[PDB]
Design a protein around this ligand. Structure first.
Ligand code: CU
Length: 166
């Protein structure tokens, strides 16, 4: 169990720790760490919630619905907080392509992978800091999809992150 705290994930921003910068986020208000589903679950319109019961409000998609963190292209520091550390297989990061439609349901086919870090089947610390590169053809509102793949189960934790790139 864990979430991306920086840049704040869509779920994290729903919690008091995230400043309640997103409203009406269902279970994300209290447990943004709990978005757990089998690996390779990428159902169109159900990426933000990973299809998980109680997280449905996260799946709404418009250009103005969610709070964005202002970022630049190039290096971006990602910080996860884990409320329950687990042996880890992988960390994968995707971002929406230039030209994607922010008023349409999220579809993984409209993202590129942009980083992949091997967990080496070890147990990470409760704060995990990684650096990924944001490609320079991205400007404006984009969604980063951060995926923590568990080493000793068939599951992953899924974190949609709303960013405004300038
Ligand atoms: Cu857990």
């Amino acid at each position: 169990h864990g979430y991306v705290a920086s840049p704040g994930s869509r779920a994290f921003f729903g919690s008091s720790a995230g400043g309640n910068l997103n409203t009406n986020v269902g279970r994300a208000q209290w447990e943004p760490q709990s978005i757990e589903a089998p690996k390779n679950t990428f159902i169109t319109g159900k990426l933000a919630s990973a299809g998980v019961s109680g997280f449905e409000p996260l799946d709404e998609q418009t250009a103005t619905r969610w709070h964005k963190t202002n970022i630049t292209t190039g290096p971006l520091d990602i910080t996860w907080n884990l409320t329950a550390q687990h042996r880890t297989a992988s960390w994968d990061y995707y971002i929406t392509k230039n030209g994607w439609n922010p008023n349409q349901p999220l579809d993984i086919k409209n993202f590129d992978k942009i980083a992949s870090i091997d967990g080496k089947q070890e147990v990470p610390n409760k704060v995990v800091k990684q650096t990924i590169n944001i490609p320079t053809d991205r400007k404006g509102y984009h969604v980063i999809y951060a995926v923590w793949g568990i080493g000793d189960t068939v599951n992953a934790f899924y974190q949609a992150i709303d960013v405004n790139i300038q």
